[PDB]
Amino acid sequence: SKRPIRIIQWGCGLMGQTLIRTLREKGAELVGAIDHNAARRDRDAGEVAGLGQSLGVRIHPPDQADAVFREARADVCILCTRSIMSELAGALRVAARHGVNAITIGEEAFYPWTTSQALTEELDQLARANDCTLTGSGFQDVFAGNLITVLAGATHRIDRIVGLTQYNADDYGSALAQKHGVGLDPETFAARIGASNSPSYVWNSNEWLCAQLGWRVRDIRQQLLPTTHTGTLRSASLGREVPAGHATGMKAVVVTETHEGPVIETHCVGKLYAPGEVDLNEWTLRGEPDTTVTIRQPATPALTCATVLNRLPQLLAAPPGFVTTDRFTPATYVSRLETEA
């Protein structure tokens, strides 16, 4: 027989709400929900996710996470909270301590082996010790990952891979807007965002490409610059107007050099959109031959969530540890989130 995959949603904001709705559509069961947001604490997860029915799954604050793991008998925790390993590791450790597989959309977690080596190695040991799998997925998994490596499989010689990924700061929560300097004046942007130069999502996803292609990274250079508009734009996530000339978000340019020779140059743009702007995804493999792929207006949030749910059967089957998706076969379409009973 088959049974529902049993999921704990940790982070019940925009992406977590989409996942609660879509996991139920595919026959999975929400068995726990954790969020620290004062407005969502104590509410039913079905209500917060916009469903027509109460699920009888109360949103618990993270200080009660152990009790929800013990009670829930979950197969997997999906973690949609923060972007950087230091801010994900706490939740991933709770999942691993309970022997529960976890998959996060936190962008650094896609490939954190060099940017947060100590935390990743510690979680890898802890996941191995508790016979469960931790991984990072989301939009990058295909759209800055296997889309490129599938095309590399048809390429004679790669000299350079050149990428552009653009997403709408207002499709996501305050964390993403903050990381992108949305609403900062030019000086504060340069001082807080530019100067600290924290790895953009494509620093890690470029490393993921090199790992899957069998290349060794020899140098990484990133520049973070503010984006701008000629008019006022509004950030719904931060609930403030952004004057013309203030940062509407940021453009990251990452150049990843290899010992082998090929280079990966990726532009990563997260900003408020002026009228008629849309998400972009375009890659060129330069060499023999040159190949250019364009996704026409990728539905970035939907593609992020669908990839996570399609990964779950593989996550359940995966060997224990912190296992990044460069070590998996590509996500396949799964009609039903049901598992052998």
Ligand X SMILES: NC(=O)c1ccc[n+]([C@@H]2O[C@H](COP(=O)([O-])OP(=O)(O)OC[C@H]3O[C@@H](n4cnc5c(N)ncnc54)[C@H](O)[C@@H]3O)[C@@H](O)[C@H]2O)c1
Q: Which of 191, 294, 317, 319 binds a copy of itself (CB under 8 A)?
A: 294
DSSP string, 165-232: EEEEGGGS-HHHHHHTTTT--HHHIIIIIITT-PPPHHHHHHHHHHHHHT--EEEEEEEEEEE--SS-
CB of 340 to ligand X, least distance (A): 29
| Cβ–Cβ < 8 Å for 33, 12 | yes
Query: Is residue 291 within the footprint of a copy of itself (CB under 8 A)?
Result: yes
- HSE-CB of 55 using CA atoms within 13 angstroms: 27
- HSE-CB of 119 using CA atoms within 13 angstroms: 18
Alpha-carbon distance values, 230 to 182, 185, 242, 252 (Å): 15, 14, 11, 20
Query: Is residue 14 within the footprint of a copy of itself (CB under 8 A)?
Result: no
Label the pairing between strands 233-235 and 263-271.
unpaired
Choose from a copy of itself, ligand X, none: what does 204 bind? Cβ within 5-8 Å by kind.
Answer: none
Choose from a copy of itself, ligand X, none: what does 107 bind? Cβ within 5-8 Å by kind.
Answer: ligand X
Q: In sequence order, what are the residues at sequence separation of 6 or more whose Cβ sits closer than 8 angstroms to the Cβ of residue 104?
A: 78, 79, 80, 81, 88, 91, 92, 134, 135, 136, 137
Choose from ligand X, a copy of itself, none: what does 64 bind? Cβ within 5-8 Å by kind.
Answer: none
Query: Is residue 13 within the footprint of ligand X (CB under 6 A)?
Result: yes
Burial of 15 (0-12, 13-18, 19+ CB in 10 A): buried
Query: Is residue 281 within the footprint of ligand X (CB under 6 A)?
Result: no
Choose from a copy of itself, ligand X, none: what does 173 bind? Cβ within 5-8 Å by kind.
Answer: ligand X
Q: Which CB atom, from 162 or from 225, has the smaller least distance to a copy of itself?
A: 162
Query: Is residue 203 within the footprint of ligand X (CB under 6 A)?
Result: no
Q: Which of 44, 185, 257, 260 binds a copy of itself (CB under 8 A)?
A: 260
Which DSSP helix (H) or strand (E) runs through 309?
helix 300-317
CB of 165 to a copy of itself, least distance (A): 14
Tokens coding 11: 């982070």
Residue type, 179: K
| Cβ–Cβ < 8 Å for 111, 326 | yes
d(CA 308, CA 23): 10
Choose from ligand X, a copy of itself, none: what does 176 bind? Cβ within 5-8 Å by kind.
Answer: ligand X
Tokens coding 107: 């962008």
Query: Is residue 144 within the footprint of ligand X (CB under 6 A)?
Result: no
Q: Which CB atom, from 81 or from 212, has the smaller least distance to ligand X?
A: 81
Choose from ligand X, a copy of itself, none: what does 82 bind? Cβ within 5-8 Å by kind.
Answer: ligand X
DSSP code of residue 336: -
Choose from a copy of itself, ligand X, none: what does 91 bind? Cβ within 5-8 Å by kind.
Answer: ligand X
Query: Is residue 216 within the footprint of a copy of itself (CB under 8 A)?
Result: no
CB of 32 to ligand X, least distance (A): 12
Residues that bind a copy of itself (CB under 8 A): 22, 25-26, 139, 141-143, 146-147, 149-158, 212-214, 260, 288-299, 302-303, 305-307, 309-310, 329-333, 335
Binding-site sequence positions for NAD(+): 10, 14-15, 35-36, 40, 81, 107, 173-174, 304
Annotated binding site for NADP(+): 10, 14-15, 35-37, 40, 81, 83, 105, 107, 137, 139, 173
